[PDB]
């Protein structure tokens, strides 16, 4: 037993990380088959980031201006193209460590692991959620751009995120692997600010199920509620409205524990209205929202890859 | 910026994980060079765990009774020995993926990453601390025994933990890679209970430094304190006494931020006596103690491996 914020094993992604240098800018790239994906702002200095015209800046870049290094060995760039906000650098060697993979555009509220990297080298791994305002709360220093987020199902890596920017608020924005930003954000150093950081209600409920499975039960009460009544409280607390689809998604956890979904909603309603009274749940003094219902089942049943 | 509980990249350890089956018991082993390390209780059924005589139970095991599988390929066991609470299974093939490595016995308060595995296959990775009562708060289901904890320095994996048992309280105990338990625990299903779960004071202070570096500063106050005065409060709150060695270890973080160690101790004293008043620090509503001073510098300076 025990429940921890757990990232996927990162070995399959470590083997895909490269360093991409263009002029004086170095960030990370993702090498899959004979293509390296990286943020298009690798072509920019920090001064260019205030109002870049990427098509114009790219005119002055040729294949040989993109230096790509896998460990200590140089790859040969034989073509390049801009797709949305990423560059695709065609190299002459397919990555021998390419895993089975897919590119997926995740929905807000879903979770993924991030392999934070610098100069093409892995630093660490941690689990994130795509927030309802389309930011993530990561750990990214200068040079971490191009680090990726992913999920693994058995032997297949589903890449869902590439890091591009930090906002002045200290939160993080980026694209899918087709280069389309999550949310309204752009790869320019501007006044762009995140909206309300709403709480992912279905995930909180999943984590309360995880708590019950792992022995934390003090918050179970004698009440029930309805979706409409619960949502009147969710709105007050800046929680996402809970839908019938969410109830359905909690079905397996409800069956495993014998606690009806709406009974758990009534427990959450009380926790929102009365606080935790100095108590903890699964070692946390706040209501955790970065575990999906699938994450909870995965960890509680020991799924491997 | 941003500060997250971050595990080491796990690829180097993933390549060392194997499945070890003896009779009807299957757990994980660690394959380094031509040796596989695993918990000696692989020789036990759950019924044997109440009062095992491991030397007697081992008499009835031969090399061929230990089935070792690396992925889908079987390794050949050519010798076995018991060292403390681990078995060393000599195999006829050195692991081609063996990293540079060391075995280290960590001190209470130090942190490490755990690669949780089942049937020799990785499930996930997360960061733990060796608690002052010599337990860890992990995520381990049946079959996770033999999963290991480690640190990485550049290219060298320092293995420090192997998982053996879960106590009835739901906390986790295990050995170093020489097979010696951390703390007073034994590999028997008995009444053994953990002592007081004291808070790792130096780590809390390190995390408060990390908070200041990353913009959370509301808890900085106008007070200072002394080691002896602070420790009168630490004792009340079941915090480890802070020593001069701890002050020295916080020196680099103190220099980076310009906040004297004893000034940060005064901030912590106020947080202990008055609580957080519903506020948060680095996304937590409790005082986090599983980041060492080294961990904070590592993450804030982007150290890679």
UniProtKB/Swiss-Prot annotation, chains A, B:
Catalytic activity: TSAVLQ-|-SGFRK-NH2 and SGVTFQ-|-GKFKK the two peptides corresponding to the two self-cleavage sites of the SARS 3C-like proteinase are the two most reactive peptide substrates. The enzyme exhibits a strong preference for substrates containing Gln at P1 position and Leu at P2 position
Annotated active site: 41, 145
Cellular location(s): Host cytoplasm; Host Golgi apparatus; Host nucleus
Position(s), cross-link Glycyl lysine isopeptide (Lys-Gly) (interchain with G-Cter in ubiquitin): 5, 90
Residue ranges annotated for the Peptidase C30 domain, each copy included: 1-305
Means of activity regulation: Inhibited by pyridone-containing alpha-ketoamides compounds 13a and 13b. In turn, alpha-ketoamide 13b (tert-butyl (1-((S)-1-(((S)-4-(benzylamino)-3,4-dioxo-1-((S)-2-oxopyrrolidin-3-yl)butan-2-yl)amino)-3-cyclopropyl-1-oxopropan-2-yl)-2-oxo-1,2-dihydropyridin-3-yl)carbamate) inhibits SARS-CoV-2 replication in human lung cells. Inhibited ex vivo by michael acceptor inhibitor N3. Inhibited ex vivo by compound 11a and 11b.
Cytoplasmic topological domain residue ranges: 1-305
Domain of life of the source: Viruses
Function (record text): Cleaves the C-terminus of replicase polyprotein at 11 sites. Recognizes substrates containing the core sequence [ILMVF]-Q-|-[SGACN]. Cleaves and inactivates human TRMT1, preventing tRNA guanine(26)-dimethylation of tRNAs. May cleave human NLRP1 in lung epithelial cells, thereby activating the NLRP1 inflammasome pathway. May cleave human GSDMD, triggering alternative GSDME-mediated epithelial cell death upon activation of the NLRP1 inflammasome, which may enhance the release interleukins 1B, 6, 16 and 18. Also able to bind an ADP-ribose-1''-phosphate (ADRP).
Subunit-structure text: 3CL-PRO exists as monomer and homodimer. Only the homodimer shows catalytic activity. Interacts with host FBXO22; this interaction promotes the proteasomal degradation of nsp5.
Protein name: 3C-like proteinase nsp5
Species of the source: Severe acute respiratory syndrome coronavirus 2
């Amino acid at each position: 037993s025990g429940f921890r914020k757990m990232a996927f094993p990162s070995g399959k992604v470590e083997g895909c990380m490269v360093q991409v240098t263009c002029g004086t800018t170095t960030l990370n790239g993702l090498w899959l088959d004979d293509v390296v994906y990286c943020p298009r702002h690798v072509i920019c200095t920090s001064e260019d980031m205030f109002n870049p015209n990427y098509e114009d800046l790219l005119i002055r870049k040729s294949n040989h201006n993109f230096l790509v290094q896998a460990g200590n060995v140089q790859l040969r760039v034989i073509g390049h193209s801009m797709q949305n906000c990423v560059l695709k650098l065609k190299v002459d060697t397919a990555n021998p460590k390419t895993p089975k993979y897919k590119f997926v555009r995740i929905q807000p509220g879903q979770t993924f692991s991030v392999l934070a990297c610098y100069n093409g080298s892995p630093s660490g791994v941690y689990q994130c959620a795509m927030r309802p305002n389309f930011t993530i709360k990561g750990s990214f220093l200068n040079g971490s751009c191009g680090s990726v987020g992913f999920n693994i199902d058995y032997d297949c890596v589903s890449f869902c995120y590439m890091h591009h920017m930090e906002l002045p608020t200290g939160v993080h924005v980026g694209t899918d692997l087709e280069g389309n930003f999550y949310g309204p954000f752009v790869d320019r150093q501007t006044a762009q600010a995140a909206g309300t950081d709403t709480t992912i209600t279905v995930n909180v409920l999943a984590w309360l199920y995880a708590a019950v499975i792992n022995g934390d039960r003090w918050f179970l009460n004698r009440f029930t509620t309805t979706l409409n009544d619960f949502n009147l409280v969710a709105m007050k607390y800046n929680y996402e409205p809970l839908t019938q689809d969410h109830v359905d998604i909690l079905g397996p956890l409800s069956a495993q524990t014998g606690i009806a979904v709406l009974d758990m909603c009534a427990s959450l309603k009380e926790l929102l209205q009365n606080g935790m009274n100095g108590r903890t749940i699964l070692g946390s003094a706040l209501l955790e929202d970065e575990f999906t219902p699938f994450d909870v089942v995965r960890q509680c049943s020991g799924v491997t890859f």
